[PDB]
Structure formats: structure tokens, C-alpha cells
């Protein structure tokens, strides 16, 4: 059992840039963080990053998300967001290696995009 922290609410403007932090307790490690958007039917994988502690983030996603790692957190930035992209953005944190494998799901950050 691990914990995941991310702010409850973030606002973005017409520039379409939103930033939030996904924080987790590392008891060790190789990390994968995935950002999920709560669509009415299912979750949508917005972006994913992997990295080893101390290294820069490797983004599988094609330039939708950028960010950095600072110990036990990742500082994410989403761009291209419009008003209808408003929703709950959940980051899934996987501590993959060395074992044991850990999975954490955050409460999600509500992103309100204005104009």
C-alpha cells in the first residue's frame, strides 16, 4: 500500500497550459506515471512517462505532456487543453523495480479550463 497526492483543483486559461504535481511515497527504483482522464464510459490514457530516480522523464506520449522528476514527485504540464477538455485527471503511479511492485491511484486533479 502506497499513497498518491495531487491537488484537488487546477485552473488553465485560453493558453491551454495546466500544471499539477503527482507526489508518492517511494520506499526504495524505476517509476512509470500515467495520466488518466475520467471519461463518462472509461478512463482515457492522456500521457505516460517513465524514468529512474535522478533522471529526466521519458515521455512515451507524443508531446501532449511535459515535466520533471524531483525525488518522490513529478511536476507535469498538459498543453493544448480547451474548455471541453475540463475534467478529472488521475495519475497512476507504478514503482516497477526493484520488487515489490507498487501501484497507486490518486484522487485525481479536477482541471477547469476557462475560455
Amino acid at each position: 500500500a502506497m499513497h498518491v497526492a495531487q491537488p484537488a483543483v487546477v485552473l488553465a486559461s485560453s493558453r491551454g497550459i495546466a500544471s499539477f504535481v503527482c507526489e508518492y511515497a517511494s520506499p526504495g527504483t524505476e517509476v512509470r506515471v500515467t495520466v488518466l482522464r475520467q471519461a463518462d464510459s472509461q478512463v482515457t490514457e492522456v500521457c505516460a512517462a517513465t524514468y529512474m530516480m535522478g533522471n529526466e522523464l521519458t515521455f512515451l506520449d507524443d508531446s501532449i505532456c511535459t515535466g520533471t522528476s524531483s525525488g518522490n514527485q513529478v511536476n507535469l504540464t498538459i498543453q493544448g487543453l480547451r474548455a471541453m477538455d475540463t475534467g478529472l485527471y488521475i495519475c497512476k503511479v507504478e514503482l516497477m523495480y526493484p520488487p515489490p511492485y507498487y501501484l497507486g491511484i490518486g484522487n485525481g486533479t479536477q482541471i477547469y479550463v476557462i475560455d
Epitope: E30, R32, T34, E45, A48, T50, D61, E94, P98
Partner: nanobody, 119 residues
Framework: EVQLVESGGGLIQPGGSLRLSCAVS????????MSWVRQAPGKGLEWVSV???????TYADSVKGRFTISRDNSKNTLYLQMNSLRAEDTAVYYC?????????????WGQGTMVTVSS
């Protein structure tokens, strides 16, 4: 427009050695994770080796001390050195930007290449 091109598979005598190559175009192999996964006829996939973004490497118990995963940065390629091959190593071998823990919409799989062990 990511692509994974495989090669180095065929027939080999038991006790012999092969090297599979995964030619990657789309992402940097040196800064990504990748896995070698095989499916023996009549069974599910088996994850035989993993390399994580920072170079850390694991192997399945059935394969430890016999296979070696490696990545060449200058050629952006993923290799699986196979050695001391037995009949059980007969399978279709895939390279994938995936991890055995959980799947992902960003998982990318090669087309697969067949390795046969016949005495």
C-alpha cells in the same frame, strides 16, 4: 510513426546460440524500457527479459544465466543474446516497449520472429 523491426531468428541446434535484434525507429531505446516476450505454441506469452529506462535488467528463472538483453544507442537497437538453447525455447519471440506489470495504450509490439529448437 513508431516501428519495431525484428530479425536474427531461425533454426538452431540445441546447445547453440542466436542473437535477436529489434531495430527501433520512433523512440530512443537507451531512455525507454523494453521487454523480450515469447509465446510457445499452445501457451500464453512468457516475459523472458526486461530492461528498464535506467539500464536495470531482469530475466525469467527459466532463462537466467542463458539470455542477455542489451541496447545499442548508436544503432537504436534492442538485442537478445540467446545461449545454451533447449527445446522449451521454441517460440515466437517479440520485442515490445511494454512492461510485464500492467499493459498500456502506449505499449508497442514488434511483428514477432520465430525461433525453432529441433535436434
Amino acid at each position: 510513426e513508431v516501428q519495431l523491426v525484428e530479425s536474427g531468428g531461425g533454426l538452431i541446434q540445441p546447445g547453440g546460440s542466436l542473437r535477436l535484434s529489434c531495430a527501433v525507429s520512433g523512440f530512443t531505446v537507451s531512455k525507454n524500457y523494453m521487454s523480450w516476450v515469447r509465446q510457445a505454441p499452445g501457451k500464453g506469452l512468457e516475459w523472458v527479459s526486461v530492461v528498464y529506462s535506467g539500464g536495470s535488467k531482469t530475466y525469467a528463472d527459466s532463462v537466467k544465466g542463458r539470455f542477455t538483453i542489451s541496447r545499442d544507442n548508436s544503432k537504436n537497437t534492442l538485442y537478445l543474446q540467446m545461449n545454451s538453447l533447449r527445446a522449451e525455447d521454441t517460440a515466437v519471440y517479440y520485442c515490445a516497449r511494454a512492461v510485464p506489470h500492467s499493459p498500456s495504450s502506449f505499449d508497442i509490439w514488434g511483428q514477432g520472429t520465430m525461433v525453432t529448437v529441433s535436434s
